[PDB]
Amino acid sequence: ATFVRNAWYVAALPEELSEKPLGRTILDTPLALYRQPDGVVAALLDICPHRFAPLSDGILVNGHLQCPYHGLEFDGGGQCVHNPHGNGARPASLNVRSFPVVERDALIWIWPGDPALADPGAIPDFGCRVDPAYRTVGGYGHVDCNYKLLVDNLMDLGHAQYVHRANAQTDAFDRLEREVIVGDGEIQALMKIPGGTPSVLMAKFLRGANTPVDAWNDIRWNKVSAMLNFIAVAPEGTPKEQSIHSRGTHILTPETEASCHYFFGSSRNFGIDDPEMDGVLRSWQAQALVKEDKVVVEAIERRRAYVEANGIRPAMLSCDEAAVRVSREIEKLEQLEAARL
Amino acid sequence: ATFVRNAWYVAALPEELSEKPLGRTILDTPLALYRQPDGVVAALLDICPHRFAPLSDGILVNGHLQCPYHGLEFDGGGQCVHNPHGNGARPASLNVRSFPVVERDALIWIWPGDPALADPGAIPDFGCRVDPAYRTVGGYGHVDCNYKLLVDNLMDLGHAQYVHRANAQTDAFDRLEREVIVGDGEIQALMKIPGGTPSVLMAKFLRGANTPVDAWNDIRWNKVSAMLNFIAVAPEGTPKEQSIHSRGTHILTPETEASCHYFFGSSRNFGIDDPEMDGVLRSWQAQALVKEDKVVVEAIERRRAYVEANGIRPAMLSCDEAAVRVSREIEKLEQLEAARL
Amino acid sequence: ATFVRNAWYVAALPEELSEKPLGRTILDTPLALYRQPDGVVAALLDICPHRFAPLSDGILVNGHLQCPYHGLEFDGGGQCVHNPHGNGARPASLNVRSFPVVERDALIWIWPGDPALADPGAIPDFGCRVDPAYRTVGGYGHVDCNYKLLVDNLMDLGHAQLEREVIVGDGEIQALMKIPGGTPSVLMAKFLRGANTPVDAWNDIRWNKVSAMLNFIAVAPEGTPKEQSIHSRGTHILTPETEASCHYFFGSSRNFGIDDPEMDGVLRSWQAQALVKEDKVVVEAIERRRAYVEANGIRPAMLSCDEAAVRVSREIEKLEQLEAARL
Ligand SMILES: COc1c(Cl)ccc(Cl)c1C(=O)O
Ligand SMILES: COc1c(Cl)ccc(Cl)c1C(=O)O
Ligand code: FES
Ligand code: FES
Ligand code: FES
Ligand SMILES: [Fe+3]
Ligand SMILES: [Fe+3]
């Protein structure tokens, strides 16, 4: 019920779309997502103007989505291009809502609010995902929790030390150094674990290479819920700019008030042509983000009723600065909109 | 929550009942339906007056339904005929509600509203179901949608062109001619598809007959949600009367506000003694009515919250006349009751 | 939504707890139940004060439960004993609620209400469960019905077909039934292979504040004190989970065939000792009909066998009102 509608959200990964429509709900709005014959992606309200049937269950005819119930056909703009009934007239009332959609950086961005306020120049920058110098692998995940819980999770990558201990635990955690940068529509949480033994996973990034290492876990947040992290590890004490790293795509899109879509990926500049390294990253993604994080956040969502019924508020720790700031920016965006209508 | 209680509804097909009670919910009312030893069907509120146990889980004793919890026995009138506890007294408070029920035309009709207003002369006529000149086959189906969505579906038989695309397909759909006839508690939609290629179904009807054909697809609606259609097809261009036909039973009974029972059947006057034609009708029903229709309407029900939250109203086409009229008669009946009671 | 919070409820059987926390909901309150290294059971609100993660999914560190999300560690009192972040300060806001818990009679009792009113002297007496003269076997069961339906069932003395007698005390109610000789079938199956000749049967049940019951099933030759008879005291305790679901703790404490594995298996069966499948179908079915009975104005029609149940039911209702009246 409480969403920030005026903003770009990822609705799907390119590989998920085709001429066969995908039905997906974004911010409590059912959408029919498909790629037209010319390759351009279209996003229509998944509700036929005639009798509300799911257009996503239909097929393309002459490149146009055909409602499976009574045959009305629509173009990517939501305009009804064919009515096989009676005089076959096509009054404006037969047009269906179409959403602004942009395919960029191997992501399908959608604007669920006022289409007049849709500005592609405001789409977060995830260029590394299509940078030939980087190798990108990732996937999709559905989680039964409010998207904000996952934003919190990610804005404190420090949870890895426990929730993903088997892979990310470090014996230098106590020596953690952290800063928070607030910018124009952007917040960054910087983390540096100095001179520690590489973690199981960082050891894999360096290929079983132990030796005293330096690690960085930064994360950038952009308006609403799009984040890109910086996971780097380098021996002794080398520069952070000359180190091996992975820029992780971590984007959340609310489905319902208590559920969300999770788009994740890894864009690395090492072992670029190595199927095994691809396996490590995918294995990590499947185990950490899709299961371990899922377990915790889904359990937290189940306890929301109790915390709200009672007057329980969270007790912040020294690692929550970035998360609280992001959280407050989102709350402000919610309030602005609530004040628009 | 919103039902027209003062009307006869089909609660079950005769073959569904026996001495073993059937538990079924009609208009949010749980019923225990069974056939007594003398063969007369009884309908009791499926809630024991003692501690609310489901009488439908009990068995008959001396022809009386015995509650499975503590043994109170009831007769078809809902009267408690035996109390095995203490002095075994049977105060009126132990009687359970019994509903007016009539077995006619191979259908079990029940009156869930004001019992004093129940009048068997008001039961729709489905005589063809027990006419020795007709061969009748059918069945039952449960659907997760408000019953009105299925009334719309049936009153707008045209959808078969796209929904049943593989069976009811017709190359004369654009040469369609409709005719609506209004009446008291009765509305009829007539449709004709002359001089065209028969669909696979009609083909199987005329035993794979060659040459063009003249079909007939009418449907009659009676107060609330009981319909009988007329599917006729004839060699080339012959009369509508002498034509081989099937009178289809299509009756809906709401279960909950978002779910309903669907009683269907075919009463044909051709291939009467042919197990195969039987298979042709049973297959169609299983395929078209239970599978294909189910999908479309259940998806529409899931989109109700969104259309209501927003102010979306349906955009009617030239094929919606009969459906809109029926829909308006039902709405009026709802209003009368809402007023009346 | 409607619970009597100020009372002791069984949250688990001893054998269910260990250093690996058990997550369980009691009266709509999620709990993390575990046994510390010294063997003492602890019960914490299963909600970390930091960001609400389930402590029940964590593990013990130095004998302290560690939240699986960001590592805060707590002691059995709910006090935060370690914060691995920043200056590692531990302000009182990091403490988590801890519930009064007592392990007695091979049962884990918890007080979910006003912690100030909790008094261990008020815990029902189930001593037979740890009496060396008795052999006790039992188990756990979950049921999708309001706990009151099971209280009714039990107060209707194993109805699966001096004399009558119902005693009403304070926070306690007993229903006694002594049946000389027999008419349908007596002597009982287990009691069979012991004590013959004319006998006397016994089937009583004791109810204690809210939903804890202990029954008495016994038999002895002609005239004989129910004390020295061949008997079994059945533990039948219910603890609401949600308004429409509950936990069922059951057990048998017998003084016969004490060293005989044969009987344990049957005396440990959920269907044979707590509720036959056929009856479980009934209480869950009754729960599904609550909406209809409430929507309409349907009230139950009592029979001659409902006396004990109605009385217990009325004592519970009074307890509900007392608490409600507070707030
Ligand atoms: C969750 O953030 C990560 C951490 Cl903490 C370590 C390694 C990786 Cl690949 C990621 C990632 O971006 O998925
Ligand atoms: C759905 O109504 C029908 C149509 Cl449109 C064509 C053929 C048949 Cl058999 C039926 C039927 O009664 O099921
Ligand atoms: S509901 Fe889409 S054409 Fe009828
Ligand atoms: S609930 Fe039917 S006899 Fe007791
Ligand atoms: S939620 Fe428990 S330490 Fe953060
Ligand atoms: Fe994580
Ligand atoms: Fe259909």
PDB file of N, CA and C in Angstrom, chain B residues 237-309:
ATOM      1  N   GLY B 237     -27.572 -25.857 -45.490  1.00  0.00           N
ATOM      2  CA  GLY B 237     -28.496 -24.851 -44.995  1.00  0.00           C
ATOM      3  C   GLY B 237     -29.910 -25.363 -44.781  1.00  0.00           C
ATOM      4  N   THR B 238     -30.135 -26.026 -43.651  1.00  0.00           N
ATOM      5  CA  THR B 238     -31.456 -26.560 -43.336  1.00  0.00           C
ATOM      6  C   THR B 238     -32.058 -25.797 -42.157  1.00  0.00           C
ATOM      7  N   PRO B 239     -33.311 -26.113 -41.799  1.00  0.00           N
ATOM      8  CA  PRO B 239     -34.004 -25.461 -40.685  1.00  0.00           C
ATOM      9  C   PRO B 239     -33.266 -25.580 -39.348  1.00  0.00           C
ATOM     10  N   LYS B 240     -33.666 -24.749 -38.391  1.00  0.00           N
ATOM     11  CA  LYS B 240     -33.067 -24.743 -37.061  1.00  0.00           C
ATOM     12  C   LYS B 240     -33.783 -25.748 -36.162  1.00  0.00           C
ATOM     13  N   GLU B 241     -35.016 -26.076 -36.527  1.00  0.00           N
ATOM     14  CA  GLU B 241     -35.829 -27.017 -35.768  1.00  0.00           C
ATOM     15  C   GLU B 241     -35.417 -28.470 -35.991  1.00  0.00           C
ATOM     16  N   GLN B 242     -35.471 -28.905 -37.246  1.00  0.00           N
ATOM     17  CA  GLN B 242     -35.130 -30.274 -37.625  1.00  0.00           C
ATOM     18  C   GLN B 242     -33.653 -30.600 -37.418  1.00  0.00           C
ATOM     19  N   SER B 243     -32.862 -29.586 -37.085  1.00  0.00           N
ATOM     20  CA  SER B 243     -31.427 -29.767 -36.895  1.00  0.00           C
ATOM     21  C   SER B 243     -31.031 -30.567 -35.662  1.00  0.00           C
ATOM     22  N   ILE B 244     -29.961 -31.339 -35.811  1.00  0.00           N
ATOM     23  CA  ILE B 244     -29.420 -32.144 -34.728  1.00  0.00           C
ATOM     24  C   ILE B 244     -28.956 -31.141 -33.672  1.00  0.00           C
ATOM     25  N   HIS B 245     -29.256 -31.396 -32.404  1.00  0.00           N
ATOM     26  CA  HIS B 245     -28.871 -30.434 -31.381  1.00  0.00           C
ATOM     27  C   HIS B 245     -28.515 -30.971 -30.002  1.00  0.00           C
ATOM     28  N   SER B 246     -27.941 -30.078 -29.202  1.00  0.00           N
ATOM     29  CA  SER B 246     -27.543 -30.362 -27.830  1.00  0.00           C
ATOM     30  C   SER B 246     -27.992 -29.227 -26.916  1.00  0.00           C
ATOM     31  N   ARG B 247     -28.816 -29.543 -25.922  1.00  0.00           N
ATOM     32  CA  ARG B 247     -29.266 -28.536 -24.971  1.00  0.00           C
ATOM     33  C   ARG B 247     -28.319 -28.635 -23.782  1.00  0.00           C
ATOM     34  N   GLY B 248     -27.460 -27.634 -23.640  1.00  0.00           N
ATOM     35  CA  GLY B 248     -26.489 -27.658 -22.563  1.00  0.00           C
ATOM     36  C   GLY B 248     -26.894 -27.046 -21.239  1.00  0.00           C
ATOM     37  N   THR B 249     -26.744 -27.831 -20.177  1.00  0.00           N
ATOM     38  CA  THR B 249     -27.045 -27.375 -18.824  1.00  0.00           C
ATOM     39  C   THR B 249     -25.821 -26.621 -18.330  1.00  0.00           C
ATOM     40  N   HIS B 250     -25.993 -25.357 -17.962  1.00  0.00           N
ATOM     41  CA  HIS B 250     -24.878 -24.561 -17.447  1.00  0.00           C
ATOM     42  C   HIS B 250     -25.396 -23.778 -16.264  1.00  0.00           C
ATOM     43  N   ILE B 251     -25.266 -24.377 -15.091  1.00  0.00           N
ATOM     44  CA  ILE B 251     -25.774 -23.771 -13.878  1.00  0.00           C
ATOM     45  C   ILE B 251     -24.701 -23.479 -12.860  1.00  0.00           C
ATOM     46  N   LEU B 252     -24.729 -22.255 -12.348  1.00  0.00           N
ATOM     47  CA  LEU B 252     -23.766 -21.800 -11.367  1.00  0.00           C
ATOM     48  C   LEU B 252     -24.396 -21.530 -10.016  1.00  0.00           C
ATOM     49  N   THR B 253     -23.695 -21.944  -8.968  1.00  0.00           N
ATOM     50  CA  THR B 253     -24.147 -21.720  -7.607  1.00  0.00           C
ATOM     51  C   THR B 253     -22.968 -21.159  -6.822  1.00  0.00           C
ATOM     52  N   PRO B 254     -23.114 -19.941  -6.294  1.00  0.00           N
ATOM     53  CA  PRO B 254     -22.011 -19.362  -5.531  1.00  0.00           C
ATOM     54  C   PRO B 254     -21.701 -20.155  -4.271  1.00  0.00           C
ATOM     55  N   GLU B 255     -20.411 -20.273  -3.966  1.00  0.00           N
ATOM     56  CA  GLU B 255     -19.970 -20.997  -2.779  1.00  0.00           C
ATOM     57  C   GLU B 255     -19.632 -19.917  -1.769  1.00  0.00           C
ATOM     58  N   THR B 256     -18.642 -19.098  -2.111  1.00  0.00           N
ATOM     59  CA  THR B 256     -18.253 -17.967  -1.287  1.00  0.00           C
ATOM     60  C   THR B 256     -18.355 -16.792  -2.255  1.00  0.00           C
ATOM     61  N   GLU B 257     -18.041 -15.596  -1.789  1.00  0.00           N
ATOM     62  CA  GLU B 257     -18.125 -14.433  -2.653  1.00  0.00           C
ATOM     63  C   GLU B 257     -17.140 -14.509  -3.815  1.00  0.00           C
ATOM     64  N   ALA B 258     -16.054 -15.261  -3.639  1.00  0.00           N
ATOM     65  CA  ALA B 258     -15.041 -15.378  -4.685  1.00  0.00           C
ATOM     66  C   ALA B 258     -14.864 -16.792  -5.243  1.00  0.00           C
ATOM     67  N   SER B 259     -15.862 -17.647  -5.051  1.00  0.00           N
ATOM     68  CA  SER B 259     -15.785 -19.013  -5.556  1.00  0.00           C
ATOM     69  C   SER B 259     -17.186 -19.527  -5.859  1.00  0.00           C
ATOM     70  N   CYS B 260     -17.292 -20.510  -6.745  1.00  0.00           N
ATOM     71  CA  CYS B 260     -18.596 -21.053  -7.087  1.00  0.00           C
ATOM     72  C   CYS B 260     -18.556 -22.493  -7.550  1.00  0.00           C
ATOM     73  N   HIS B 261     -19.742 -23.098  -7.597  1.00  0.00           N
ATOM     74  CA  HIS B 261     -19.918 -24.462  -8.045  1.00  0.00           C
ATOM     75  C   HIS B 261     -20.441 -24.339  -9.476  1.00  0.00           C
ATOM     76  N   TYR B 262     -20.033 -25.260 -10.338  1.00  0.00           N
ATOM     77  CA  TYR B 262     -20.455 -25.226 -11.724  1.00  0.00           C
ATOM     78  C   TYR B 262     -21.028 -26.579 -12.115  1.00  0.00           C
ATOM     79  N   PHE B 263     -22.324 -26.604 -12.399  1.00  0.00           N
ATOM     80  CA  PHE B 263     -22.985 -27.831 -12.817  1.00  0.00           C
ATOM     81  C   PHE B 263     -23.239 -27.741 -14.320  1.00  0.00           C
ATOM     82  N   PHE B 264     -22.688 -28.695 -15.062  1.00  0.00           N
ATOM     83  CA  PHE B 264     -22.825 -28.701 -16.510  1.00  0.00           C
ATOM     84  C   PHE B 264     -23.286 -30.030 -17.056  1.00  0.00           C
ATOM     85  N   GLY B 265     -23.821 -29.991 -18.265  1.00  0.00           N
ATOM     86  CA  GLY B 265     -24.290 -31.211 -18.874  1.00  0.00           C
ATOM     87  C   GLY B 265     -24.711 -30.979 -20.302  1.00  0.00           C
ATOM     88  N   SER B 266     -24.851 -32.074 -21.033  1.00  0.00           N
ATOM     89  CA  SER B 266     -25.266 -32.030 -22.420  1.00  0.00           C
ATOM     90  C   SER B 266     -26.414 -32.993 -22.607  1.00  0.00           C
ATOM     91  N   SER B 267     -27.486 -32.507 -23.220  1.00  0.00           N
ATOM     92  CA  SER B 267     -28.655 -33.331 -23.496  1.00  0.00           C
ATOM     93  C   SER B 267     -28.838 -33.307 -25.005  1.00  0.00           C
ATOM     94  N   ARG B 268     -28.367 -34.357 -25.668  1.00  0.00           N
ATOM     95  CA  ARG B 268     -28.439 -34.426 -27.123  1.00  0.00           C
ATOM     96  C   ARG B 268     -29.505 -35.367 -27.652  1.00  0.00           C
ATOM     97  N   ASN B 269     -29.915 -35.120 -28.891  1.00  0.00           N
ATOM     98  CA  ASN B 269     -30.929 -35.927 -29.552  1.00  0.00           C
ATOM     99  C   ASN B 269     -30.319 -36.679 -30.735  1.00  0.00           C
ATOM    100  N   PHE B 270     -28.996 -36.785 -30.743  1.00  0.00           N
ATOM    101  CA  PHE B 270     -28.288 -37.485 -31.807  1.00  0.00           C
ATOM    102  C   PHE B 270     -27.232 -38.419 -31.210  1.00  0.00           C
ATOM    103  N   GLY B 271     -26.964 -39.531 -31.890  1.00  0.00           N
ATOM    104  CA  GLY B 271     -25.982 -40.483 -31.398  1.00  0.00           C
ATOM    105  C   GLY B 271     -26.313 -40.915 -29.984  1.00  0.00           C
ATOM    106  N   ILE B 272     -27.597 -40.842 -29.651  1.00  0.00           N
ATOM    107  CA  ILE B 272     -28.095 -41.196 -28.328  1.00  0.00           C
ATOM    108  C   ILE B 272     -27.489 -42.464 -27.739  1.00  0.00           C
ATOM    109  N   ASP B 273     -27.377 -43.514 -28.543  1.00  0.00           N
ATOM    110  CA  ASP B 273     -26.786 -44.757 -28.060  1.00  0.00           C
ATOM    111  C   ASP B 273     -25.391 -44.923 -28.636  1.00  0.00           C
ATOM    112  N   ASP B 274     -24.499 -44.005 -28.278  1.00  0.00           N
ATOM    113  CA  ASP B 274     -23.127 -44.047 -28.767  1.00  0.00           C
ATOM    114  C   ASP B 274     -22.138 -43.570 -27.709  1.00  0.00           C
ATOM    115  N   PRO B 275     -21.471 -44.519 -27.040  1.00  0.00           N
ATOM    116  CA  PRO B 275     -20.482 -44.254 -25.992  1.00  0.00           C
ATOM    117  C   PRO B 275     -19.419 -43.276 -26.472  1.00  0.00           C
ATOM    118  N   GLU B 276     -19.192 -43.280 -27.784  1.00  0.00           N
ATOM    119  CA  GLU B 276     -18.205 -42.405 -28.404  1.00  0.00           C
ATOM    120  C   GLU B 276     -18.644 -40.951 -28.395  1.00  0.00           C
ATOM    121  N   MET B 277     -19.845 -40.683 -28.894  1.00  0.00           N
ATOM    122  CA  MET B 277     -20.330 -39.312 -28.906  1.00  0.00           C
ATOM    123  C   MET B 277     -20.271 -38.823 -27.461  1.00  0.00           C
ATOM    124  N   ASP B 278     -20.559 -39.734 -26.534  1.00  0.00           N
ATOM    125  CA  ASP B 278     -20.504 -39.431 -25.110  1.00  0.00           C
ATOM    126  C   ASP B 278     -19.110 -38.896 -24.814  1.00  0.00           C
ATOM    127  N   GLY B 279     -18.101 -39.619 -25.287  1.00  0.00           N
ATOM    128  CA  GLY B 279     -16.727 -39.211 -25.067  1.00  0.00           C
ATOM    129  C   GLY B 279     -16.416 -37.870 -25.695  1.00  0.00           C
ATOM    130  N   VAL B 280     -17.114 -37.550 -26.780  1.00  0.00           N
ATOM    131  CA  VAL B 280     -16.904 -36.286 -27.473  1.00  0.00           C
ATOM    132  C   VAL B 280     -17.427 -35.134 -26.621  1.00  0.00           C
ATOM    133  N   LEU B 281     -18.579 -35.337 -25.995  1.00  0.00           N
ATOM    134  CA  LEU B 281     -19.143 -34.292 -25.153  1.00  0.00           C
ATOM    135  C   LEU B 281     -18.390 -34.167 -23.831  1.00  0.00           C
ATOM    136  N   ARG B 282     -18.153 -35.297 -23.170  1.00  0.00           N
ATOM    137  CA  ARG B 282     -17.428 -35.303 -21.903  1.00  0.00           C
ATOM    138  C   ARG B 282     -16.041 -34.686 -22.071  1.00  0.00           C
ATOM    139  N   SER B 283     -15.390 -34.971 -23.198  1.00  0.00           N
ATOM    140  CA  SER B 283     -14.063 -34.423 -23.461  1.00  0.00           C
ATOM    141  C   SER B 283     -14.150 -32.911 -23.601  1.00  0.00           C
ATOM    142  N   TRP B 284     -15.085 -32.455 -24.428  1.00  0.00           N
ATOM    143  CA  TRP B 284     -15.278 -31.025 -24.634  1.00  0.00           C
ATOM    144  C   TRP B 284     -15.477 -30.314 -23.297  1.00  0.00           C
ATOM    145  N   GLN B 285     -16.399 -30.828 -22.494  1.00  0.00           N
ATOM    146  CA  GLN B 285     -16.687 -30.244 -21.189  1.00  0.00           C
ATOM    147  C   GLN B 285     -15.457 -30.210 -20.294  1.00  0.00           C
ATOM    148  N   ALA B 286     -14.730 -31.320 -20.244  1.00  0.00           N
ATOM    149  CA  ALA B 286     -13.531 -31.398 -19.420  1.00  0.00           C
ATOM    150  C   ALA B 286     -12.523 -30.387 -19.933  1.00  0.00           C
ATOM    151  N   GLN B 287     -12.326 -30.407 -21.245  1.00  0.00           N
ATOM    152  CA  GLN B 287     -11.388 -29.517 -21.898  1.00  0.00           C
ATOM    153  C   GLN B 287     -11.796 -28.043 -21.856  1.00  0.00           C
ATOM    154  N   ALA B 288     -12.946 -27.725 -22.443  1.00  0.00           N
ATOM    155  CA  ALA B 288     -13.424 -26.342 -22.498  1.00  0.00           C
ATOM    156  C   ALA B 288     -13.900 -25.730 -21.176  1.00  0.00           C
ATOM    157  N   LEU B 289     -14.957 -26.296 -20.602  1.00  0.00           N
ATOM    158  CA  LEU B 289     -15.537 -25.776 -19.363  1.00  0.00           C
ATOM    159  C   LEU B 289     -14.692 -25.829 -18.086  1.00  0.00           C
ATOM    160  N   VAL B 290     -14.070 -26.969 -17.814  1.00  0.00           N
ATOM    161  CA  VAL B 290     -13.278 -27.119 -16.596  1.00  0.00           C
ATOM    162  C   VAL B 290     -11.841 -26.603 -16.666  1.00  0.00           C
ATOM    163  N   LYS B 291     -11.223 -26.694 -17.837  1.00  0.00           N
ATOM    164  CA  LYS B 291      -9.849 -26.235 -17.995  1.00  0.00           C
ATOM    165  C   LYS B 291      -9.722 -24.814 -18.551  1.00  0.00           C
ATOM    166  N   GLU B 292     -10.128 -24.629 -19.802  1.00  0.00           N
ATOM    167  CA  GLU B 292     -10.028 -23.335 -20.475  1.00  0.00           C
ATOM    168  C   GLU B 292     -10.771 -22.154 -19.840  1.00  0.00           C
ATOM    169  N   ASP B 293     -12.036 -22.342 -19.480  1.00  0.00           N
ATOM    170  CA  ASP B 293     -12.788 -21.256 -18.852  1.00  0.00           C
ATOM    171  C   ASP B 293     -12.237 -20.945 -17.470  1.00  0.00           C
ATOM    172  N   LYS B 294     -11.929 -22.002 -16.728  1.00  0.00           N
ATOM    173  CA  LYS B 294     -11.399 -21.886 -15.381  1.00  0.00           C
ATOM    174  C   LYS B 294     -10.213 -20.926 -15.342  1.00  0.00           C
ATOM    175  N   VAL B 295      -9.241 -21.143 -16.224  1.00  0.00           N
ATOM    176  CA  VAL B 295      -8.050 -20.294 -16.277  1.00  0.00           C
ATOM    177  C   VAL B 295      -8.348 -18.797 -16.408  1.00  0.00           C
ATOM    178  N   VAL B 296      -9.116 -18.430 -17.433  1.00  0.00           N
ATOM    179  CA  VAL B 296      -9.458 -17.028 -17.692  1.00  0.00           C
ATOM    180  C   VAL B 296     -10.199 -16.317 -16.560  1.00  0.00           C
ATOM    181  N   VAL B 297     -11.236 -16.954 -16.038  1.00  0.00           N
ATOM    182  CA  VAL B 297     -12.021 -16.341 -14.977  1.00  0.00           C
ATOM    183  C   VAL B 297     -11.312 -16.293 -13.628  1.00  0.00           C
ATOM    184  N   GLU B 298     -10.470 -17.279 -13.334  1.00  0.00           N
ATOM    185  CA  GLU B 298      -9.761 -17.249 -12.061  1.00  0.00           C
ATOM    186  C   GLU B 298      -8.733 -16.132 -12.085  1.00  0.00           C
ATOM    187  N   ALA B 299      -8.148 -15.877 -13.257  1.00  0.00           N
ATOM    188  CA  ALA B 299      -7.167 -14.809 -13.379  1.00  0.00           C
ATOM    189  C   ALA B 299      -7.886 -13.470 -13.213  1.00  0.00           C
ATOM    190  N   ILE B 300      -9.081 -13.358 -13.801  1.00  0.00           N
ATOM    191  CA  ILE B 300      -9.864 -12.125 -13.689  1.00  0.00           C
ATOM    192  C   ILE B 300     -10.234 -11.872 -12.225  1.00  0.00           C
ATOM    193  N   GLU B 301     -10.574 -12.924 -11.492  1.00  0.00           N
ATOM    194  CA  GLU B 301     -10.924 -12.758 -10.079  1.00  0.00           C
ATOM    195  C   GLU B 301      -9.730 -12.206  -9.300  1.00  0.00           C
ATOM    196  N   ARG B 302      -8.529 -12.658  -9.647  1.00  0.00           N
ATOM    197  CA  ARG B 302      -7.340 -12.193  -8.949  1.00  0.00           C
ATOM    198  C   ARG B 302      -7.048 -10.724  -9.218  1.00  0.00           C
ATOM    199  N   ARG B 303      -7.633 -10.181 -10.284  1.00  0.00           N
ATOM    200  CA  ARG B 303      -7.417  -8.776 -10.637  1.00  0.00           C
ATOM    201  C   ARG B 303      -8.527  -7.863 -10.124  1.00  0.00           C
ATOM    202  N   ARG B 304      -9.498  -8.445  -9.426  1.00  0.00           N
ATOM    203  CA  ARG B 304     -10.613  -7.658  -8.907  1.00  0.00           C
ATOM    204  C   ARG B 304     -10.165  -6.601  -7.913  1.00  0.00           C
ATOM    205  N   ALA B 305      -9.267  -6.975  -7.010  1.00  0.00           N
ATOM    206  CA  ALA B 305      -8.781  -6.025  -6.020  1.00  0.00           C
ATOM    207  C   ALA B 305      -8.212  -4.782  -6.696  1.00  0.00           C
ATOM    208  N   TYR B 306      -7.436  -4.977  -7.758  1.00  0.00           N
ATOM    209  CA  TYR B 306      -6.833  -3.852  -8.455  1.00  0.00           C
ATOM    210  C   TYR B 306      -7.863  -2.983  -9.170  1.00  0.00           C
ATOM    211  N   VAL B 307      -8.794  -3.607  -9.887  1.00  0.00           N
ATOM    212  CA  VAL B 307      -9.789  -2.825 -10.607  1.00  0.00           C
ATOM    213  C   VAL B 307     -10.672  -2.046  -9.638  1.00  0.00           C
ATOM    214  N   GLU B 308     -10.987  -2.644  -8.493  1.00  0.00           N
ATOM    215  CA  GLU B 308     -11.815  -1.949  -7.517  1.00  0.00           C
ATOM    216  C   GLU B 308     -11.036  -0.837  -6.828  1.00  0.00           C
ATOM    217  N   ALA B 309      -9.795  -1.125  -6.437  1.00  0.00           N
ATOM    218  CA  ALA B 309      -8.958  -0.129  -5.766  1.00  0.00           C
ATOM    219  C   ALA B 309      -8.882   1.108  -6.653  1.00  0.00           C
TER     220      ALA B 309
END
